Amino acid sequence: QGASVLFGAPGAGDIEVFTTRPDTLFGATYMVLAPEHPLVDQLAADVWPQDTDPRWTGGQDSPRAAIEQYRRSIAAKSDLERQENKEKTGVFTGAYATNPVSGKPVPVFIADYVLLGYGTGAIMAVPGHDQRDWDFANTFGLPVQEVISGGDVTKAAYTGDGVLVNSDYLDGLDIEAAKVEVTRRLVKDGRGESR
């Protein structure tokens, strides 16, 4: 029903996520990793790229500084404290992963509501069609992309039924067919499997 999805990160191997909505993969506009994720240190960019939003930096000079300050601000928090967090916190790593189907860049964030041990340690965020993502995106200014017609993503995530849009060669497909097509492409390209 769902899918495991591998996002390529330059020079650092793969970031694995699990999603129940592989059909929304063209709508993934960012990734969120657990702050303790083993790849975070390698992903940290030398400088903030020009597309960095000042709400993503913690006010720090560099990705490394933002990451180590964030890690310290959350080190004491319990694991339910983190996962049910009503406040959205996080920082940008500077890094971009490759969308395994569309090939587009996906900025990589860390945030304490993602935890090691309770899942893959990374999620793919589709704010257009996942309310939790919509709220996190809303506080930081992350992009919000509609890929399922039928709602209004400027106001809230659309979790209902509709056909695919803004999804290249998936355009017009039913959600159930798009789920399979994305899974089969991942399998064929060695970038995931059904789960």
Residue numbers in the entry: 304 to 498
Report text from the authors:
Comparing unliganded and liganded residues in M. abscessus editing domain structures shows a sizable shift of residues 416–422, located around the adenosine pocket, upon drug binding, including ordering of Y421 to interact with the EPT-AMP adduct phosphate, and a decrease of B factors in the neighbouring residues. This increase in order could explain the relatively lower entropic contribution to binding observed in ITC, although an unliganded M. tuberculosis structure is not available for comparison.
Leucyl-tRNA synthetases (LeuRSs) are examples of aaRSs that rely on their editing domains to limit misaminoacylation of tRNA with near-cognate amino acids and maintain the fidelity of the genetic code. Here, we identified epetraborole (EPT) from the MMV pandemic response box as an inhibitor against the essential protein leucyl-tRNA synthetase (LeuRS) in M. abscessus. Benzoxaboroles were shown to inhibit LeuRS in fungi, gram-negative pathogens and most recently M. tuberculosis. To gain insight into the interactions between EPT and LeuRS, we solved the crystal structure of the M. abscessus editing domain (LeuRS303-498).
